[PDB]
Design a protein around this nucleic acid. Sequence first.
RNA 1: AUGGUUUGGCACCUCGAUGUCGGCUCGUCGCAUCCUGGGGCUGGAGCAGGUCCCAAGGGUUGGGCUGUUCGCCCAUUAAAGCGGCACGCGAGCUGGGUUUAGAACGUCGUGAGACAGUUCGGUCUCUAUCCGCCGCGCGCGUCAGAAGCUUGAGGAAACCUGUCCCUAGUACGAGAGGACCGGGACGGACGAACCUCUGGUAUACCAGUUGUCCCACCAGGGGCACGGCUGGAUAGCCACGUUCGGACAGGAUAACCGCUGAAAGCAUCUAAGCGGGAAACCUCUUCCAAGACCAGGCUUCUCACCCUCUAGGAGGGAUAAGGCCCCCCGCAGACCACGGGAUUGAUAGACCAGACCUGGAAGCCUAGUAAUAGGUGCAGGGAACUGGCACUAACCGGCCGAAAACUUAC
Lengths: 122, 209, 111, 117, 54
Amino acid sequence: MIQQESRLKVADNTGAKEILCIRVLGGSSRRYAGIGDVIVATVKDAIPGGNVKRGDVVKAVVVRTVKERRRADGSYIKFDENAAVIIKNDNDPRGTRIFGPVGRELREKKFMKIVSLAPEVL
Amino acid sequence: RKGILGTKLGMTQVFDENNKVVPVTVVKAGPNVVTRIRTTERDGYSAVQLAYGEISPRKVIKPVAGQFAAAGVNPRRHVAELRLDDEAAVAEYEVGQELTAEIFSDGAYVDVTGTSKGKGFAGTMKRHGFRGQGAAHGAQAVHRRPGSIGTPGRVFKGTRMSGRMGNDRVTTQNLKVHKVDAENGVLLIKGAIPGRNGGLVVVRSAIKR
Amino acid sequence: NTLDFVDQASLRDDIPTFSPGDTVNVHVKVIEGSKERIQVFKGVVIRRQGGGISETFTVRKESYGVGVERTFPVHSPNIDHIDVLTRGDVRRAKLYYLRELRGKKAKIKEK
Amino acid sequence: PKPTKGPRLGGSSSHQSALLANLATSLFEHGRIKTTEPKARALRPYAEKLITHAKKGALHNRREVMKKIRDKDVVHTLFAEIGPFYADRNGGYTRIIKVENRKGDNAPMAVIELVRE
Amino acid sequence: AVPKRRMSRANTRSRRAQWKAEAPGLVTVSVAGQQRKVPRRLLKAARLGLVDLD
RNA sequence: AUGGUUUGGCACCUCGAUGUCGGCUCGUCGCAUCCUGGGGCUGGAGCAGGUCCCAAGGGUUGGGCUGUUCGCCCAUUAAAGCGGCACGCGAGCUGGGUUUAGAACGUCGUGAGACAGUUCGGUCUCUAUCCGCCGCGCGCGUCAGAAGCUUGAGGAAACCUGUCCCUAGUACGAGAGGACCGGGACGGACGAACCUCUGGUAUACCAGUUGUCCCACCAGGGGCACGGCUGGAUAGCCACGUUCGGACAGGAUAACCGCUGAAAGCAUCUAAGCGGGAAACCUCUUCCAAGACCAGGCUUCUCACCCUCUAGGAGGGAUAAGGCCCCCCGCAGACCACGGGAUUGAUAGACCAGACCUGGAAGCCUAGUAAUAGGUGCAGGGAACUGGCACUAACCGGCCGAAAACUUAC
């Protein structure tokens, strides 16, 4: 459960290390962003030599959540951190490499490229 | 519209053929005996009256025993009426006929009616979902009270203020019957049906679906 | 347990005996574009909340520097088979303290 | 046994525990005591389970009783006659008799005693 | 808040008439031979000689 | 020309007191409509708009700055409406601003001091009588006393919406672009019910452990230290959880599109008529409802016994069906009420067994110098859940509680 003013680690190689959630897209007055949700985020920490800079307003997708998320078959998946991957308007990563596992929810949300790039999908 | 009287047993878990989980509430749609026919020419409305539950013959008072004897069936604990639409619909029931669980079929949509749990004297926060006032920043003993009540200097009728909550008849619509176990007279209804375990419920074919 | 007659119909046998602490690999069938494959989840059983049909167990694993926890119903048909590798020696019924331990400190004694 | 639904007896949980232990001690010491009806109502199951421990009298059960009774003479009587006396009775070791209301505060009084039939 | 007005006699009496005590029901019992009335709540105790009868 | 939503003007109202701005909480109304709904002409090719009529059912976001309203900005959204109600709401809250006494700066004054200039600090009282409103009972009434099941006059609640997929990359369009109508799935917010799952709580549950005192001592335990502190934690309550909902259909209509045609030999959606036509209206869905005084209906049960005054009516007593009190209780509950049981009994407690929680009891033996470890042993301990079991308590018991007749018609 990620909401406004929440901080997420970046699971990409875009040079951003940490982003702050600004909005949860997907309907007015929407509250929480789970795995597979797109958020508007601002970069708080960045690699000194990276392509992105601090204070950039970007669009990211949540790939891990600390709060366990139910699945259709009654099983649950839970990670140890909230992580996001910066994307462009066409739902492709702005980076070239994804770090750490991701959830299966990225398949039904049509994030095929992120799924393919990920080391493992759970 | 079919109907039957039952009892809420509890809720459990089952899996359908796509391996998804279905949380199902178990309802004991026990045997019901038709006790009276309401006809337009006699009562002004068409309806059928069903009896359910098992009770000792020494517990029924004389008026009830007389009514059951006039019907021609042995007494039961609970009695309720099913309101049909027209005489053509009520022609298919006759007194003494027994209804069991198989009147419903798998995948059917049903309307369960029961009495909600009691919650006692409840505040506006719980009875009506009022947002509270601040817990700090100077708020003085108003952490849960409604606040304003709002020319004529009169509290208009319908004020959503605190009071007794619960214990009302509730209908849940468009519940799917996952399975109709004919051996035990048990309906497996996907979803949560009103009331506590062991309460009386009425299962009717959905009016919408 | 009044609902037992309902329960036993869907109850699933052949389930191996295991306790919190053992290391198991769970063979989980998944859907990948409408075809079948079995994805193996190997980790430590950190809890088991008895419920009969609603029995659940939790397997925790460390993968690529991030811990992952997965909760499965014990009698879920989505699990084709469970295999227990080793038996662990623990003093608790629920191993929640393992969520704060990494590597050397996160090891489990062997029975 | 079943914890009290409402507020505790002595005004706190620890006070209620001490009250119950003392009341059981007096009951086993004398055979019948007179107290307010809620106190006897709460005392019945507690004393009945202590007697159950005494019935199957082993060292383990003796220590189980001592961790509540705290009085060694009462424990000795409980494991020497009260236990063996109820050897062939399954439950219902105590009975409650309602008596006349108290004068100072109109508190309903009741007398709780061990059955000796 | 303070009463804005003095209650009339009718209203005061009508509200005051609700403050009353109900009569307990009594049943007969034989203690030491002589019959006497006792509340049914105390019947068993009277039969056991646990209530003082003046 | 409207309105008294803006500054005004009057001083009719209060100086033996009518709280002054914003904000929070909770509303209610208007339509001069922000979205959704129906339209029309387009300087409308389609898309999309422009503008305009009908339409008030629902909805109308979260933050930065400022005491702020206002306002600017940041992200969204279908949309981020305008107003009335003491510019709603301090015996509901705040006290940041304004509006006492302290102090400073600028300016004015010789000075005490002053400034619809600034700056820091600065007591917000009350046990609800009446009306009102939310809930709950007692009494009486409904032409004998009761009990089941109900009809419903009449009210209340609810009414939101997006994206994607097929039709269709077609109509139109130089192309770009881009459809109508109709089906399907998944969502956001809101609401209700529920506790199988997840998660929270846990003051009579299990285990670990610190300090100290006690149980003569060891062992094993106990009291106190926020339940001493920690790790878990079934039931109940709950949401962060589960499931369901907003309908479909009909009727009369608005703007509007029409048919059949007069006055007025033609024409005219019209003055006669007849049709279509919206989230608005009436039904439809859910709930309350016969104190609905027109006090309803269908049934079933009791369906009788005295005494007194004076025999006119009344009064009193005892009963039936039934009810209440006392009693055992409840997931029903402030009290009351409601629901169940009452020996012809499983209502509660105990007891036995299971489920579940905890996690391997005590004693003994073995190994070790000891801390401690292994066996006996899925051990011991235990609340709520389930099934058995009259062992304990529901008792040799009290109080209430049933008919004037007449008129007409058949």
